[PDB]
Design an enzyme around this catalytic site. Structure first.
Site, PDB file in Angstrom:
ATOM      1  N   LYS A  39       0.787  -1.333   0.060  1.00  0.00           N
ATOM      2  CA  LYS A  39      -0.186   0.103  -0.035  1.00  0.00           C
ATOM      3  C   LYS A  39       0.870   1.336  -0.176  1.00  0.00           C
ATOM      4  O   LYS A  39       2.026   1.136   0.221  1.00  0.00           O
ATOM      5  CB  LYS A  39      -0.902  -0.131   1.178  1.00  0.00           C
ATOM      6  CG  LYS A  39      -0.343  -0.466   2.411  1.00  0.00           C
ATOM      7  CD  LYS A  39      -1.278  -0.183   3.528  1.00  0.00           C
ATOM      8  CE  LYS A  39      -0.687   0.012   4.707  1.00  0.00           C
ATOM      9  NZ  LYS A  39      -1.049  -0.733   5.654  1.00  0.00           N
ATOM     10  N   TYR A 272      16.919  30.317   4.271  1.00  0.00           N
ATOM     11  CA  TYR A 272      15.779  31.071   4.678  1.00  0.00           C
ATOM     12  C   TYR A 272      15.870  31.539   5.977  1.00  0.00           C
ATOM     13  O   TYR A 272      16.570  30.771   6.945  1.00  0.00           O
ATOM     14  CB  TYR A 272      14.570  30.624   4.339  1.00  0.00           C
ATOM     15  CG  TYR A 272      13.943  30.410   2.744  1.00  0.00           C
ATOM     16  CD1 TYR A 272      13.772  31.756   2.267  1.00  0.00           C
ATOM     17  CD2 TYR A 272      13.717  29.417   2.476  1.00  0.00           C
ATOM     18  CE1 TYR A 272      13.413  31.651   0.808  1.00  0.00           C
ATOM     19  CE2 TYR A 272      13.155  29.291   0.976  1.00  0.00           C
ATOM     20  CZ  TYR A 272      13.158  30.575   0.138  1.00  0.00           C
ATOM     21  OH  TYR A 272      12.347  30.720  -1.068  1.00  0.00           O
TER      22      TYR A 272
HETATM   23  C1  LIG Z   1      10.032  28.371  -4.620  1.00  0.00           C
HETATM   24  C2  LIG Z   1      10.427  29.815  -5.275  1.00  0.00           C
HETATM   25  C3  LIG Z   1       9.868  30.936  -5.393  1.00  0.00           C
HETATM   26  C4  LIG Z   1       8.106  31.176  -4.743  1.00  0.00           C
HETATM   27  O1  LIG Z   1       8.249  32.144  -3.871  1.00  0.00           O
HETATM   28  P1  LIG Z   1       7.131  32.216  -2.904  1.00  0.00           P
HETATM   29  O2  LIG Z   1       6.520  33.688  -2.842  1.00  0.00           O
HETATM   30  O3  LIG Z   1       7.834  32.041  -1.180  1.00  0.00           O
HETATM   31  O4  LIG Z   1       6.152  31.181  -2.961  1.00  0.00           O
HETATM   32  C5  LIG Z   1      10.270  32.314  -5.758  1.00  0.00           C
HETATM   33  N1  LIG Z   1      11.476  32.431  -6.166  1.00  0.00           N
HETATM   34  C6  LIG Z   1      12.288  31.383  -6.211  1.00  0.00           C
HETATM   35  C7  LIG Z   1      13.895  31.512  -6.786  1.00  0.00           C
HETATM   36  C8  LIG Z   1      11.925  30.047  -5.578  1.00  0.00           C
HETATM   37  O5  LIG Z   1      13.037  28.995  -5.641  1.00  0.00           O
HETATM   38  C1  LIG Z   2      -0.805  -1.347   6.627  1.00  0.00           C
HETATM   39  C2  LIG Z   2      -1.209  -2.447   7.411  1.00  0.00           C
HETATM   40  C3  LIG Z   2      -0.266  -3.708   7.727  1.00  0.00           C
HETATM   41  C4  LIG Z   2       1.132  -3.893   7.419  1.00  0.00           C
HETATM   42  O1  LIG Z   2       1.666  -4.414   8.661  1.00  0.00           O
HETATM   43  P1  LIG Z   2       3.124  -3.960   9.075  1.00  0.00           P
HETATM   44  O2  LIG Z   2       2.867  -3.719  10.555  1.00  0.00           O
HETATM   45  O3  LIG Z   2       3.668  -3.009   8.118  1.00  0.00           O
HETATM   46  O4  LIG Z   2       3.872  -5.169   8.868  1.00  0.00           O
HETATM   47  C5  LIG Z   2      -0.945  -5.012   8.213  1.00  0.00           C
HETATM   48  N1  LIG Z   2      -2.452  -4.898   8.676  1.00  0.00           N
HETATM   49  C6  LIG Z   2      -3.108  -4.108   8.361  1.00  0.00           C
HETATM   50  C7  LIG Z   2      -4.659  -4.078   8.844  1.00  0.00           C
HETATM   51  C8  LIG Z   2      -2.378  -2.623   7.892  1.00  0.00           C
HETATM   52  O5  LIG Z   2      -3.535  -1.575   7.745  1.00  0.00           O
END
Ligand SMILES: *Cc1c(COP(=O)(O)O)cnc(C)c1O
Ligand SMILES: *Cc1c(COP(=O)(O)O)cnc(C)c1O
Ligand SMILES: [Cl-]
Ligand SMILES: [Cl-]
Lengths: 386, 386
Positions: A39, A272
């Site tokens: 899954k 940042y």
């Molecule tokens: C990811 C990114 C953005 C986006 O800016 P936000 O306003 O923070 O979403 C702008 N410029 C650069 C170079 C980026 O890598």
């Molecule tokens: C995801 C899931 C598992 C997987 O078991 P592990 O702990 O990953 O070995 C088993 N049973 C159910 C019902 C699940 O949703």
């Protein structure tokens, strides 16, 4: 080696997956089959290639989270049983029946209504059903033996449905206190015993996840559900520290250095918030992984990656697509050098379990949140493919 | 309503996206273009439909993280300029030219080797290039005036490459102390005036992110890069609290209740670890979202969802594909009821910003880590599609 535009990738070692399946097979009773749990994109490892390999090397059946996940596997040419572990809306009964996907259910009305839909649409093929008995996980399933009996009768009177399994889930099988797990087991067996006294013949019974399979192999019944263990990861430190089965982690996450620089000129602020200031002779390397890849922003000024066999620290904040790491004063490193983000390099290792510890979560979340925009490569018999 | 097998989905409101663009357009200088930043799958909103809508309502160019993100948009029929913001390996120079993708670079050697690749195959479009100037982000870009001039001379001497932009990135423009931002701006201007002094004519200049476009619209130059704001989310509380632009959140995350039950009989344990015990009269609702969808496991005994206009708590831990919430004692809730995980419902709201605060992170991470296994639906002119 590998040609990418953005040089970040995953390597899934299917030799390790084979060795993991073999270690569980060798530990549990010879009679018990293995259902490989694939899954959430094969726990982020890629469902198709992990499923294919599992079925070649010991597993008989697959489990997924949804019909859509099961259909991806059919389209890959897979013919093995596929069980949907969660709830499937009646809107997809027709479709599930057409693709031979097995659904879990546990309610009379659902059984009756699913049967009616298939009747009304002509019933080309019958829908396989497993019944979920809730013995303490409190998530899905029928909770009393009397209601269980009504669910079974409804399923059996439904000619367009076919009963192929019955199961439960352990909520604490990976913990040192086994009290609840033994109570769940006892309750499950009591419910199954109730049905048999009614003269009902049981289909395939399964109850073990990875934890119970290792700590309680005698509960393996007709089949276990192998999830986390398939990928070479233990369900808890406690189960690992039992030292009963040897698992090898299958996933590694790698990149190549995009740029290297010495922070000679001011300002020497990194990323940042300007949360990190480099020394004038300090070397900073930029890597093409970030938090939209699933590399947690909480590793900001905390995480480590491996470069040339040694741990080098994340410098400053993780950004959406990139991180910076410090190679130290006059550190050696060049654009194009391979870095290991999760996994092994020369003598060193940064395991998914160690990252999960850093982040106060579990290895399941670390691998299953790896973005699909990272390409996956597979290793089999020692050499790569996709 | 929507018909899904697994009933969890995203709704992206493109009317809101239109407004957001219009609000930013109305705020920055009228000569300034907008480059819509649709990297990391449109910040988890879906890169294609957001890009398409943006280019229709105020944006003229796009930005992505990688060549492959750009190729996805090209395959959907988008023909607008697309800038790759990160590092692109020389192995992808030919491909980027074929697909008319614009690459970022900032090193003499890269310009020369890329040009060499293209000559050897003199038959593709001239690879457009933007130069990144690192003025303090310390991530990628050239950091001195001298080196910038050599890079520009190399690019100009490279006849198979075309210089179409020059940019820098602000690391703290969303913060109350504007000292570093003003120093970055001053440094960027000084490098550009240095080039002009050499007789060099500048291509498209861009430097603003969402934060600086809002707080320093006078820095918009030829073009801004609109990211977080496009999706109706603010880059920081400080920027939001300036109250200068009105943005509307485009994304909501929803599910339908998979099962509802009263915890009448023992054990009343809920989810892994049995960290939560229900009252005999308490109603537990199971929802088909979990941490492999990007719903953080750290919301285990903390998160909230909206049901019938009210906040209901996550009960016990978050699992890979499901969560359980308490509708509290007595109950009132049915299988199939709609729940809002991120967003508004009646008068109530759980914003992505509130989720990010709880998790000590930022709204950017919350939306950009939404898994691709959640289907996205789009609202345009008040009606849904996909
Ligand atoms: C990811 C990114 C953005 C986006 O800016 P936000 O306003 O923070 O979403 C702008 N410029 C650069 C170079 C980026 O890598
Ligand atoms: C995801 C899931 C598992 C997987 O078991 P592990 O702990 O990953 O070995 C088993 N049973 C159910 C019902 C699940 O949703
Ligand atoms: Cl369950
Ligand atoms: Cl940068």
């Amino acid at each position: 080696m590998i040609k990418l535009c953005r040089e970040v990738w995953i390597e899934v070692n299917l030799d390790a997956v084979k060795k993991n399946l073999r270690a569980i097979r060798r530990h549990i009773p010879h009679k018990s089959k293995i259902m490989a749990v694939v899954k959430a994109n094969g726990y982020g490892h890629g469902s198709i290639e992990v499923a294919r390999h599992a079925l070649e090397h010991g597993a008989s059946e697959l489990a997924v989270a949804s019909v859509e996940e099961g259909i991806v596997l059919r389209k890959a040419g897979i013919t093995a049983p596929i069980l949907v572990l969660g709830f499937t809306s009646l809107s997809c009964v027709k479709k599930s029946a057409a693709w031979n996907i097995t659904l879990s259910a546990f309610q009379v009305d659902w059984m009756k209504e699913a049967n009616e839909i298939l009747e009304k649409e002509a019933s080309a093929n019958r829908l396989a059903i497993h019944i979920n008995v809730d013995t303490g996980m409190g998530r899905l399933g029928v909770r009393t033996k009397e209601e269980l009996l009504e669910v079974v009768k409804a399923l059996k009177a439904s000619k367009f449905l076919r009963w192929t399994g019955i199961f439960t889930h352990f909520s604490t099988a990976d913990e040192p206190d086994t009290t609840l797990t033994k109570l769940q087991h006892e309750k499950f067996i009591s419910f199954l015993s109730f049905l048999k006294k009614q003269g009902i013949e049981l289909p395939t019974v399964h109850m073990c996840n990875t934890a119970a399979a290792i700590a309680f192999p005698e509960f393996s019944a007709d089949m276990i559900r192998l999830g986390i263990g398939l990928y070479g990861l233990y369900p808890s430190a406690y189960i690992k520290q039992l030292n009963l089965v040897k698992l090898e982690p299958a996933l590694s996450l790698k990149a190549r250095i995009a740029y290297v620089k010495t922070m000679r000129t001011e300002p020497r602020t990194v990323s940042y918030g300007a949360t990190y200031i480099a020394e004038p002779n300090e070397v900073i390397a930029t890597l093409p992984i970030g938090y939209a890849d699933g590399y947690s922003r909480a590793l900001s000024n905390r995480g480590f990656v491996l470069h040339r066999g040694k741990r080098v620290p994340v410098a400053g904040r993780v950004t959406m697509d990139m991180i910076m790491v410090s190679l130290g004063e006059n550190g050696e490193g060049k654009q194009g050098d391979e870095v290991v983000i999760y996994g092994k390099q020369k003598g060193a290792e940064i395991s998914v379990d160690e990252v999960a510890e850093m982040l106060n979560t579990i290895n399941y979340e670390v691998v299953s949140t790896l973005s699909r925009r990272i390409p996956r490569f597979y290793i089999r018999d020692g050499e790569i493919f996709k």
